[PDB]
Amino acid sequence: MQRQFTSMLQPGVNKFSLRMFGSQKAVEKEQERVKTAGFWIIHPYSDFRFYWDLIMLIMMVGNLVIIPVGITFFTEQTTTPWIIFNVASDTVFLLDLIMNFRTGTVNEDSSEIILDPKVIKMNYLKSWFVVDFISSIPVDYIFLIVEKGRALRIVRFTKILSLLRLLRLSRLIRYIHQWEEIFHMTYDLASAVVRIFNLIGMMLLLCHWDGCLQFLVPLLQDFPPDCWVSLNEMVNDSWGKQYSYALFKAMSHMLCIGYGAQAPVSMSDLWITMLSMIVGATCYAMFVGHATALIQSLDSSRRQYQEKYKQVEQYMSFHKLPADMRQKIHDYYEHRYQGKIFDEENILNELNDPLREEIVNFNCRKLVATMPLFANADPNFVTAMLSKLRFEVFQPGDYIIREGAVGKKMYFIQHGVAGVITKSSKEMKLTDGSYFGEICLLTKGRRTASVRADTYCRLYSLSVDNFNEVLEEYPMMRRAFETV
Amino acid sequence: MQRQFTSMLQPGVNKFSLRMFGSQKAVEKEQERVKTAGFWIIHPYSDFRFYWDLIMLIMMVGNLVIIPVGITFFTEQTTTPWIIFNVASDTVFLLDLIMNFRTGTVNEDSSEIILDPKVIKMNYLKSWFVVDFISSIPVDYIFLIVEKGRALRIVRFTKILSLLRLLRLSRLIRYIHQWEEIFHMTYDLASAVVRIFNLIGMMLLLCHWDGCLQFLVPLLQDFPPDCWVSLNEMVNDSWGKQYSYALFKAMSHMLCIGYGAQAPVSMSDLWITMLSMIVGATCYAMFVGHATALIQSLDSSRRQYQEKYKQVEQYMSFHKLPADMRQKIHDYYEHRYQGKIFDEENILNELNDPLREEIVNFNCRKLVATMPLFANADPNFVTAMLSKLRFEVFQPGDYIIREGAVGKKMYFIQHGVAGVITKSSKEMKLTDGSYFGEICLLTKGRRTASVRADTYCRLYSLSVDNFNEVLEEYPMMRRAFETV
Amino acid sequence: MQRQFTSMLQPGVNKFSLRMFGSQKAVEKEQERVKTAGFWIIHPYSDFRFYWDLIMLIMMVGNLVIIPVGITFFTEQTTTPWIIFNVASDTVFLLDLIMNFRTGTVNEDSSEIILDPKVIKMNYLKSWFVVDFISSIPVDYIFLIVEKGRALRIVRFTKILSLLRLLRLSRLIRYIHQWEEIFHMTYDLASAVVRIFNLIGMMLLLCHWDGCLQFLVPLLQDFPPDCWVSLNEMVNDSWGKQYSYALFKAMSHMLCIGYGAQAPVSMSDLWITMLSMIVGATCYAMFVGHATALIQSLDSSRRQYQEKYKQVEQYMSFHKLPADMRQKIHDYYEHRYQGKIFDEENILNELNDPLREEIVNFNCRKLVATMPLFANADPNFVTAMLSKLRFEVFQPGDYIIREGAVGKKMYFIQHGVAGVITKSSKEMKLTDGSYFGEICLLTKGRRTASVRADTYCRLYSLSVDNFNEVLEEYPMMRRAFETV
Amino acid sequence: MQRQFTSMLQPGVNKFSLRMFGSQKAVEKEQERVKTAGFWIIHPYSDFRFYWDLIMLIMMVGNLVIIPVGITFFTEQTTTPWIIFNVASDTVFLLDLIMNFRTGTVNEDSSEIILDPKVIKMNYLKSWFVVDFISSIPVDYIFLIVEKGRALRIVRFTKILSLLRLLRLSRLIRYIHQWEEIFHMTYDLASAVVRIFNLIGMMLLLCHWDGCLQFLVPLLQDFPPDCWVSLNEMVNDSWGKQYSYALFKAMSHMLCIGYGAQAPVSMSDLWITMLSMIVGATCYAMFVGHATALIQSLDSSRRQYQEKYKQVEQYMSFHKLPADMRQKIHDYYEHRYQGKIFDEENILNELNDPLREEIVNFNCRKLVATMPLFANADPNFVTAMLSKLRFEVFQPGDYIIREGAVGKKMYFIQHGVAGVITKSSKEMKLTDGSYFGEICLLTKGRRTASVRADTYCRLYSLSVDNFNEVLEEYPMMRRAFETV
Known part of the structure; x- marks a missing residue:
C-alpha cells in the first residue's frame, strides 16, 4: 500500500x-x-x-x-x-x-x-x-x-x-x-482536429439541452393551451416521443430548417424559439469557421508549392520571356523539386552535426566511393568533404561543361545519361555512378572537352574554392593529393 | 473652475x-x-x-x-x-x-x-x-x-x-x-475580436429595425386585409405581442428559417420579405467570414509549427530517407523545439543591447560561473562572451566529440547525461552544470577522448573562432588566459 | 473627320x-x-x-x-x-x-x-x-x-x-x-473587392432568370392543374404580381428559406425546385467564400503583427523567462514598433538611391545639423554618412553607455530624456536634438562617463566601423576631422 | 500475345x-x-x-x-x-x-x-x-x-x-x-480543384442514398399510416414519382430548406429526418470550407502584392513621412514592380547555369551589343559580365548622376528619356539602347557632368567593384581594356 x-x-x-x-x-x-x-x-x-x-x-x-x-x-x-x-x-x-x-x-x-x-x-x-x-x-x-x-x-x-x-x-x-x-x-x-471535436461535443450538448428547455418552459407553465405540446396534442405521450419531438424542434431551430409542425403562437414559444435560433446560427457559423481552418491546414504543402511557383510566373511575365523559354523553366521546376517545397539550407542549419553527417552519408557515399581519391582517404576527411557538394539538375541538350572555358567545378552523375564530346574521339556516354571534370582539382586551365546532357541529369558538384576550404583543414591529405 | x-x-x-x-x-x-x-x-x-x-x-x-x-x-x-x-x-x-x-x-x-x-x-x-x-x-x-x-x-x-x-x-x-x-x-x-463585436452590434440593430419595418409598412397602409398583421388577427394585440411577432418574423428572414406563420400574400409583404432576406443573407455571410478570420488567428503558432514541420517531411520524402532515419529526425525536432516556433537570430537582432544582455545572463550565467576562467574574469568580459554561445541538442547514442578528430568547439551541459569514454580509464559520467572539451582553447590538436550522449542532452557550445573574436577585444584577459 | x-x-x-x-x-x-x-x-x-x-x-x-x-x-x-x-x-x-x-x-x-x-x-x-x-x-x-x-x-x-x-x-x-x-x-x-462585386452581379442575374424559369415551365405546359401558378390561383393576375411571386420563389430557393406557399406537387415543380436549390446553395457557398477572402485581406497588417509577436511569446516560453522580464520585452516591442510591422532593410533595398537619400534626409538631417562637424562639412559627405545611422530604443532605467567600457558607438537623441552620470559632477540632463559619446571617434579607450535613460528614449547611433567605412571614401574630410 | x-x-x-x-x-x-x-x-x-x-x-x-x-x-x-x-x-x-x-x-x-x-x-x-x-x-x-x-x-x-x-x-x-x-x-x-470535385461527388452520392433511405424505412415497416408516403397518398405512384419526391425530401433536409410537404409525425420519420439534417449540415459546412480554400488560392499573387505593399504603408506611417513623399514612393512601386510580386535573387539562385545564362542573354544582350568593348570581346566573357548588371528605375526629375560626385557605377538605358546636363554645352537627350557614365571604368575621379530623368527611366547598371570582380577572371580582356 x-x-x-x-x-x-x-x-x-x-x-x-x-x-x-x-x-x-x-x-x-x-x-x-x-x-x-x-x-x-x-x-x-x-x-x-x-x-x-x-x-x-x-x-x-x-x-x-x-x-x-x-x-x-x-x-x-x-x-x-x-x-x-x-x-x-x-x-x-x-x-x-x-x-x-x-x-x-x-x-x-x-x-x-x-x-x-x-x-x-x-x-x-x-x-x-x-x-x-x-x-x-x-x-x-x-x-x-x-x-x-x-x-x-x-x-x-x-x-x-x-x-x-x-x-x-x-x-x-x-x-x-x-x-x-x-x-x-x-x-x-493536429490543433484544428482537436479544436473541431471540442466544438462538435458542445454543439451536441447545447442541442440536447435546448431540446429539454423547449419542453421545460411549457411544463413550468402547466402546459398552456397555446403552446406546441398542447397544439400537437402530445401532453400524454411517452417520455421518448416527447423527447424525440423536442430534440427535433431544437435541432430544427439550430440548423434553421423550420420551426416544427407550425410557427410559435405564444410569447413563451416565440422567445425560446429566438434564443434557440441565435445559439444555433452562432454554433453553425463557428463550425463552418473551424471546418475552414481544418481544410486550409491539410494541403498546406501543395498550397505553398503553388504560391512559390506562381511567383516564377510573375517573374517570367514581368521580364516578358517567350513561351518556349517559359516551358523550359516550368519543366525544370518539375524535375528539380517534383512538387515538394522545402529549404535545404534552412533545414540543415537547425539539425545537429550527427544528423547532418548521417543524411549526407546516406545521399552521397555511394556516389563518392567509386572515386580513386575517396576509396583511399580517411573517413573523417571524406565525411567532411561530402557536406560541400551542391545538387544540380540539367535538361536534355544543355551543356554542363564547354571546351576552352575555365573549369571552376567538377561533377558526379546521380541519375541520367551524359555524353563527353571532345573533337579528338567518338563520343563517350556517362551514366549513374560515374564522374567527370576532375582535372580542375589542384591546378588551373581551360576544359579539355565539352560535356552535355542526353537525358534529364541529376548531378552533384563541388567548386575548387570549397575543395580548397576543406583541404586547408587536412594538410596530410593535401600532401597525398599533391603526389597524384 | x-x-x-x-x-x-x-x-x-x-x-x-x-x-x-x-x-x-x-x-x-x-x-x-x-x-x-x-x-x-x-x-x-x-x-x-x-x-x-x-x-x-x-x-x-x-x-x-x-x-x-x-x-x-x-x-x-x-x-x-x-x-x-x-x-x-x-x-x-x-x-x-x-x-x-x-x-x-x-x-x-x-x-x-x-x-x-x-x-x-x-x-x-x-x-x-x-x-x-x-x-x-x-x-x-x-x-x-x-x-x-x-x-x-x-x-x-x-x-x-x-x-x-x-x-x-x-x-x-x-x-x-x-x-x-x-x-x-x-x-x-486583438483585431478579429474587435471586428466581430462591431458586426454583432450591427446584426442586432438591423434585425431590430427590420422587425419594426415589417409592421410599419402595414401600419402606413392602414392594415390591409391581405397583410400578415390582419391574417394573424393581431391588429388589436398589445404593443409587446406585436413587437415580439414582428421581431420573430424579421429574425426568421435574417436567418432563413422561415417566413412566420405563412408565406407573403400581398405585394408589400413580398418586397419587404425579400429586402429582409437579402440583408440577412449578407449579414450572415459577413459573420461566417469574421468567425473564420477570428478562428484562423487563435492557433497561429500551432499552425505555423505544423507548416514548418511538413516542409521537413517534403525534404525527407524528396531525398527518400528510410523510416528509421525519419524517426530520428522527427524525434529530434520535438526535443529541440518542443512545438514552439520562433527565430532566435531574428528576435535577438530587433531587441536592444540591455535586453540581449539580460536574456543571455538569465540563460547562461549559472552554467558559465562554475568554470575556473569565468569565476575569476571581469564582468564586462564574460557578459560579452556569453553572447557567442550556440545552443545544441543531442539524442542518445550520438557522439558529441570523437577521439583523434580536430577539436574546433567546446561544450557545457545544461541538461541530460553524457559519458567521457577514453580508452585509458573506466567511463566517467557528466551531468547538468558540468563542462568538457576545454583543451581546444588557445592551442591546436586532435581530441584526447570521445564523449557520447547516454540520454537527451541539451548543451551550449562556442567555437575557437568565436572565442578568438571575443579575446581580440580584451587583450588583458588574453594575457591572463595565456598564463594557464 | x-x-x-x-x-x-x-x-x-x-x-x-x-x-x-x-x-x-x-x-x-x-x-x-x-x-x-x-x-x-x-x-x-x-x-x-x-x-x-x-x-x-x-x-x-x-x-x-x-x-x-x-x-x-x-x-x-x-x-x-x-x-x-x-x-x-x-x-x-x-x-x-x-x-x-x-x-x-x-x-x-x-x-x-x-x-x-x-x-x-x-x-x-x-x-x-x-x-x-x-x-x-x-x-x-x-x-x-x-x-x-x-x-x-x-x-x-x-x-x-x-x-x-x-x-x-x-x-x-x-x-x-x-x-x-x-x-x-x-x-x-483591391482584387477581393472586384471579385465579390462580379459574384454579386451573377447572383442577382441567376436569381432573376430562375424567377422567370419557375413561371416559364408552367406556361410551356399551358398551366397544368397541379403547378404552383394554378394552386395559388394567379394565372389571371397582372404581369407584375406574377413576376414578384416567381422572383420570391426563386430567391426563397436560392437562400433556402422555404418553397413559397407550399412544397411542390408536380414533377415539373419538383425538378425545377431542386435545380434552383442547387444553383442557390452553390452561389451562397461561393459568396461566403469570397466574403471570407475579402475580410482576411482587410486587417492583414494587424494580423501579421499579432503573428510576429506570438513568436516572441514562443521564444520567451521556450527559454522560461520570468514574468517581469516578459513585461519588459512586451513593453519594448510596443515602444519600438507601435503595432506597425515592416522590414526597414528589405524596403530600403528595393527603393532607388534618390528615394533612400530623400527618406534619410527627412528623418535625420534635423538631428545631425546641430553637430559641429556636420554644420561645416560637404553636403555630398553628410548625405552619405546619414545612411549608416541605426535607430535604437531604450526603456527607463537602462544604461546606454557604461563608464570604463570600450566605446564602439556614439549616439543622437531623437526623443526622450537621458542623463549623463559621471562621478566628477552633478548629473546633466539631455533631451531631443542633443548628442553624446562623440569622443569614441578617431581614437580608442574606455568611456569617461555613464549615460542612462530617465524616460523612453528614441535614439540614432553609428559604430566607429561604419564611420571609418564612410571616411575611407572621403579622405579630404578625413584630414579635416584629424585636425580636431 | x-x-x-x-x-x-x-x-x-x-x-x-x-x-x-x-x-x-x-x-x-x-x-x-x-x-x-x-x-x-x-x-x-x-x-x-x-x-x-x-x-x-x-x-x-x-x-x-x-x-x-x-x-x-x-x-x-x-x-x-x-x-x-x-x-x-x-x-x-x-x-x-x-x-x-x-x-x-x-x-x-x-x-x-x-x-x-x-x-x-x-x-x-x-x-x-x-x-x-x-x-x-x-x-x-x-x-x-x-x-x-x-x-x-x-x-x-x-x-x-x-x-x-x-x-x-x-x-x-x-x-x-x-x-x-x-x-x-x-x-x-491544382489541389483545391481536385479536392472540391471529390466532395461534390460524395455530396451527390450521399444525397442519392439518403433519398433511398427515406423511402426504404417506410417500406421495411410496410407503409405505416403515419409516415410521409401514406400521408402524401403515394404508396401506389410510379417508381419515378416516388424517387423524385424521396430525393426532393433528402435534398431539402441536406440543404435545410424544409421537411417536404409537412414536418415528421412518426418516430421513424423523426429520427431519419434528423440523421439527414446532420449529414447535410456537415457536408454543406465542409463544402463552404473547400470553396473558401479554393477562392483563397486563385488570387494568391494579387494578395501577396497587397500584403507586401501594406508593409510599405506601415513603414511610411511609422516614420511619419509627408503625403507628397508617400505619393513618390507609391508611384515608384507601381513603375518598378507593376503589381507583379517575385524575388529575383531567390528565383535565379534555384535555376541552373544554362537557364540563368539564357534569361540574362534574352534581357540584356541587345542593350550591351551596342557598346564598343562588348562588340569586340569574347562571348564567354560578355555572358559572364551580363550576370552582374542590376536593374534600376528612376522617376522624372531625379538625378541619376551628379557632377563632381565620385562615380562608383555606370549605366545603360532600357526605356525612357534621360538628359546629360554639363555646363559646357546645350543639353543632349539619351534614349532606349544608349549608355552613359562609362569613364568610371579602370580609373578614379569625380563625374564630369550630371544626368537626369526627363521621363520614367528603366536602366541597367554595374559597379566598378563588380566589373573588377569579373575582369580578375579574364586577364586577357583586362589587357585589352587597359589599352583603351
Whole structure:
C-alpha cells in the first residue's frame, strides 16, 4: 500500500515529464519539491490526477446528459433510483471540490507548478470555488427538506434548483483543456482536429439541452393551451416521443430548417424559439469557421508549392520571356523539386552535426566511393568533404561543361545519361555512378572537352574554392593529393 | 473652475499621448499648439472629447433602439413623455453638431491634427455636416407646427419624417471607429475580436429595425386585409405581442428559417420579405467570414509549427530517407523545439543591447560561473562572451566529440547525461552544470577522448573562432588566459 | 473627320499604355505596327474599343434583364415595340460580331497583341464565334417567317428559340474580365473587392432568370392543374404580381428559406425546385467564400503583427523567462514598433538611391545639423554618412553607455530624456536634438562617463566601423576631422 | 500475345515512371525487380492496373447509383435482368479482390513498392480484405438459397442484406485517391480543384442514398399510416414519382430548406429526418470550407502584392513621412514592380547555369551589343559580365548622376528619356539602347557632368567593384581594356 500511496501523487518519470522538465534529475527534483511541501499535496502532472480527471470526464458526460432529461420528462426526482444517482454523483463532485484545494496549479509564466497548500487554497477560493460549490452540493434536496418544515408550486421551483448541476460544464471545459495541452506535449495532435471535436461535443450538448428547455418552459407553465405540446396534442405521450419531438424542434431551430409542425403562437414559444435560433446560427457559423481552418491546414504543402511557383510566373511575365523559354523553366521546376517545397539550407542549419553527417552519408557515399581519391582517404576527411557538394539538375541538350572555358567545378552523375564530346574521339556516354571534370582539382586551365546532357541529369558538384576550404583543414591529405 | 476648464480641451500626459507624440516635451508642444490656435478649440485626443463621445454612445444606442419602437407600435409621438425624450435628445445631438466645428481632425498623413478653426469648419461643412444636420433638428415637430397653420394623412407622413433620426447611426459608426483606434494604441486589442463585436452590434440593430419595418409598412397602409398583421388577427394585440411577432418574423428572414406563420400574400409583404432576406443573407455571410478570420488567428503558432514541420517531411520524402532515419529526425525536432516556433537570430537582432544582455545572463550565467576562467574574469568580459554561445541538442547514442578528430568547439551541459569514454580509464559520467572539451582553447590538436550522449542532452557550445573574436577585444584577459 | 477616324483605332499615349509598353517611343512603335497591318484593324487597348465595349455592357445588362421578362410574362413578341427592341439590339450585337474579326487579341505570352487580320480571323472562328453567332442573329423571327410558309405549338417553340439570346452572357463575362485587368493596371483596385462585386452581379442575374424559369415551365405546359401558378390561383393576375411571386420563389430557393406557399406537387415543380436549390446553395457557398477572402485581406497588417509577436511569446516560453522580464520585452516591442510591422532593410533595398537619400534626409538631417562637424562639412559627405545611422530604443532605467567600457558607438537623441552620470559632477540632463559619446571617434579607450535613460528614449547611433567605412571614401574630410 | 501479356503487368517507360524512378535505367531495374519476384505479380504503376481500375471506377459509379434504387423502389431482385446485373458485377468485383493479392503496394517511406507475394498477401488480409470480401460475394442470394431449404419477413431481411454492396464505396475512395496522386505527379493539378470535385461527388452520392433511405424505412415497416408516403397518398405512384419526391425530401433536409410537404409525425420519420439534417449540415459546412480554400488560392499573387505593399504603408506611417513623399514612393512601386510580386535573387539562385545564362542573354544582350568593348570581346566573357548588371528605375526629375560626385557605377538605358546636363554645352537627350557614365571604368575621379530623368527611366547598371570582380577572371580582356 504505502509505497504506491505516496508514488501516485507526484510526477512519474515518463515521456511527458522527461520532455517537460528536461531530464530525470529535473523530474526527481520536482518529486522532492512536492514531498517536502505538505501532507497529501497533488502535483498537476501526477498519474492520480490523470485517472481522477478521467473518472470526472465519464461522470460529467453522464450527468450533463441524464440530468436535463430526468428533470424535464419525468414526474418527480424524489424516488429511490434518482435519490441514489444524485447522492452518488454529488458526493463524487464534492470529493473533486476538496481535492482542488490539495492539487497544485500551472501558469503562463511556465515556472514550477504552484505547490504551497496556502497559495493553492487562496488562489482557488477566488478563481472558481463558488461555481464549483453551488454545483457540488444537492441544493434542491436541501431546499426540499427545509420546505418540508402549495405542492404544485414547490415542485416547479425545485425543478429550477435541480439545474444548478449544469454548471459542472465549467469543470468539463477546464479538465478537457488541461488534458488536451498534455496530449499536445506527447502525441503530435493536429490543433484544428482537436479544436473541431471540442466544438462538435458542445454543439451536441447545447442541442440536447435546448431540446429539454423547449419542453421545460411549457411544463413550468402547466402546459398552456397555446403552446406546441398542447397544439400537437402530445401532453400524454411517452417520455421518448416527447423527447424525440423536442430534440427535433431544437435541432430544427439550430440548423434553421423550420420551426416544427407550425410557427410559435405564444410569447413563451416565440422567445425560446429566438434564443434557440441565435445559439444555433452562432454554433453553425463557428463550425463552418473551424471546418475552414481544418481544410486550409491539410494541403498546406501543395498550397505553398503553388504560391512559390506562381511567383516564377510573375517573374517570367514581368521580364516578358517567350513561351518556349517559359516551358523550359516550368519543366525544370518539375524535375528539380517534383512538387515538394522545402529549404535545404534552412533545414540543415537547425539539425545537429550527427544528423547532418548521417543524411549526407546516406545521399552521397555511394556516389563518392567509386572515386580513386575517396576509396583511399580517411573517413573523417571524406565525411567532411561530402557536406560541400551542391545538387544540380540539367535538361536534355544543355551543356554542363564547354571546351576552352575555365573549369571552376567538377561533377558526379546521380541519375541520367551524359555524353563527353571532345573533337579528338567518338563520343563517350556517362551514366549513374560515374564522374567527370576532375582535372580542375589542384591546378588551373581551360576544359579539355565539352560535356552535355542526353537525358534529364541529376548531378552533384563541388567548386575548387570549397575543395580548397576543406583541404586547408587536412594538410596530410593535401600532401597525398599533391603526389597524384 | 478655470484651471480645469482649459485643461480638459487639450491632450493630457497619459499612456496614449506619450506613446503617440513620443515624449512629454512633444505632448507639451501640442498643448501649446492648441492653446495658441483660438477660443475653446478641442484636440481630438482630449479627455473632454472622450467623455463627451462616451455620453454620445450611450445616447445613440438608446435613441436608435427606442425611436423605431416609439414610431411603429404607439399611437402618437405628441404626448408629454415623447416630447420630453425627443427635445432632450435633439438638443444633445445639436450640441454635438456645434462641437464638431470646434473639434480638430486626424488624417492618414499622420501629421499633427488639423487645429485651425476655419480649416476645421470648411472641412466639416463639406464632409458630414448635412447628414448630421437633418438628424439633429426635430424635422417632424417643425413640419407639424407648420401643418397646424386630413389628420389620417398628416400623421402617417409625420411617422416617415420621424425616422430621419436613424441617420445618427453614421455618428455611432464614426465615433466607435475613432475610439477603437485609440484603444488599439493602448490596450493590445486583438483585431478579429474587435471586428466581430462591431458586426454583432450591427446584426442586432438591423434585425431590430427590420422587425419594426415589417409592421410599419402595414401600419402606413392602414392594415390591409391581405397583410400578415390582419391574417394573424393581431391588429388589436398589445404593443409587446406585436413587437415580439414582428421581431420573430424579421429574425426568421435574417436567418432563413422561415417566413412566420405563412408565406407573403400581398405585394408589400413580398418586397419587404425579400429586402429582409437579402440583408440577412449578407449579414450572415459577413459573420461566417469574421468567425473564420477570428478562428484562423487563435492557433497561429500551432499552425505555423505544423507548416514548418511538413516542409521537413517534403525534404525527407524528396531525398527518400528510410523510416528509421525519419524517426530520428522527427524525434529530434520535438526535443529541440518542443512545438514552439520562433527565430532566435531574428528576435535577438530587433531587441536592444540591455535586453540581449539580460536574456543571455538569465540563460547562461549559472552554467558559465562554475568554470575556473569565468569565476575569476571581469564582468564586462564574460557578459560579452556569453553572447557567442550556440545552443545544441543531442539524442542518445550520438557522439558529441570523437577521439583523434580536430577539436574546433567546446561544450557545457545544461541538461541530460553524457559519458567521457577514453580508452585509458573506466567511463566517467557528466551531468547538468558540468563542462568538457576545454583543451581546444588557445592551442591546436586532435581530441584526447570521445564523449557520447547516454540520454537527451541539451548543451551550449562556442567555437575557437568565436572565442578568438571575443579575446581580440580584451587583450588583458588574453594575457591572463595565456598564463594557464 | 479623318484625323480622329484613324486615331481612335490605335493605342493613345495615356497612363495605361505608357505603363504597359514602358515609354512613349514604345507606344508610338505599337501605333506604327497597327497602321502598317491593314485596313481599319483595331488594337485591344484602343479608345474605340473601350467606348464600344462600354456601350455593349449597357446593351447586355439591359437585354439580359428585359428578354427573360418579355418572353415569360407577356402574350407575344410579334408586336411593334418588341420588334423594334429586338431588331435594334440584334443589329448592334451583329456589328460587335463583325468587329471581333477586325480587333486584335492579347495572350499569356505577354507578347505584342496579335494584329494580323488573317491570324485574328482564324483564331476567333475557332474559339468563340459559334456562341457569338447563334446569339447575334434573330433565330426566332427567321424561324417564324419560315413557319409562316398549330398556333399553340409554334408560339411555344418560338419562346424557347428566343432564349438563345441569353448566350450574350458569355460576351458580358469576356468584356468585363478584359476591362477589369485594364483597371487593375491603372487604378490600384483591391482584387477581393472586384471579385465579390462580379459574384454579386451573377447572383442577382441567376436569381432573376430562375424567377422567370419557375413561371416559364408552367406556361410551356399551358398551366397544368397541379403547378404552383394554378394552386395559388394567379394565372389571371397582372404581369407584375406574377413576376414578384416567381422572383420570391426563386430567391426563397436560392437562400433556402422555404418553397413559397407550399412544397411542390408536380414533377415539373419538383425538378425545377431542386435545380434552383442547387444553383442557390452553390452561389451562397461561393459568396461566403469570397466574403471570407475579402475580410482576411482587410486587417492583414494587424494580423501579421499579432503573428510576429506570438513568436516572441514562443521564444520567451521556450527559454522560461520570468514574468517581469516578459513585461519588459512586451513593453519594448510596443515602444519600438507601435503595432506597425515592416522590414526597414528589405524596403530600403528595393527603393532607388534618390528615394533612400530623400527618406534619410527627412528623418535625420534635423538631428545631425546641430553637430559641429556636420554644420561645416560637404553636403555630398553628410548625405552619405546619414545612411549608416541605426535607430535604437531604450526603456527607463537602462544604461546606454557604461563608464570604463570600450566605446564602439556614439549616439543622437531623437526623443526622450537621458542623463549623463559621471562621478566628477552633478548629473546633466539631455533631451531631443542633443548628442553624446562623440569622443569614441578617431581614437580608442574606455568611456569617461555613464549615460542612462530617465524616460523612453528614441535614439540614432553609428559604430566607429561604419564611420571609418564612410571616411575611407572621403579622405579630404578625413584630414579635416584629424585636425580636431 | 505473350510479348504484351508480360509487358502490361510492369512499369512502362513514360512521363510518370521516368519522373518517379528518375531515369530509364531506374525504370528498367524496377521492371527486372518484378519479373524476378513471382508469377503474374502486378506493379502498382502498371498500365494493366490503370485500365483495370478505370473499369472499376465505371463499374462502381454504376453499381452505387443503381443498387439503392433497385432495392428500394422495385418489388423483387429475383427476376432475370437483376440476376444478370448482380452476377456480372459480383464476379467482376471478385476478380478485383483476387487481383488485390497479386498487386504490390506503395508506402509513405517512399521505398520501392512492396512486391513479394507473401508480403502483399499478409498485408492485404489484415488491412482491407474483410470489407472487400463481404461486398464482393452475393450475400443476399446465398442467404436466399439457404432460406429456400414467412415470405413477407424473408424479403425484407433480404433487402437489408443486399445493401452490403454499398461498402464498395471504400474501393471507390481508395482507387480515386491512388490515381489522383499519380495525376498530380504528371498533369500539374491544382489541389483545391481536385479536392472540391471529390466532395461534390460524395455530396451527390450521399444525397442519392439518403433519398433511398427515406423511402426504404417506410417500406421495411410496410407503409405505416403515419409516415410521409401514406400521408402524401403515394404508396401506389410510379417508381419515378416516388424517387423524385424521396430525393426532393433528402435534398431539402441536406440543404435545410424544409421537411417536404409537412414536418415528421412518426418516430421513424423523426429520427431519419434528423440523421439527414446532420449529414447535410456537415457536408454543406465542409463544402463552404473547400470553396473558401479554393477562392483563397486563385488570387494568391494579387494578395501577396497587397500584403507586401501594406508593409510599405506601415513603414511610411511609422516614420511619419509627408503625403507628397508617400505619393513618390507609391508611384515608384507601381513603375518598378507593376503589381507583379517575385524575388529575383531567390528565383535565379534555384535555376541552373544554362537557364540563368539564357534569361540574362534574352534581357540584356541587345542593350550591351551596342557598346564598343562588348562588340569586340569574347562571348564567354560578355555572358559572364551580363550576370552582374542590376536593374534600376528612376522617376522624372531625379538625378541619376551628379557632377563632381565620385562615380562608383555606370549605366545603360532600357526605356525612357534621360538628359546629360554639363555646363559646357546645350543639353543632349539619351534614349532606349544608349549608355552613359562609362569613364568610371579602370580609373578614379569625380563625374564630369550630371544626368537626369526627363521621363520614367528603366536602366541597367554595374559597379566598378563588380566589373573588377569579373575582369580578375579574364586577364586577357583586362589587357585589352587597359589599352583603351
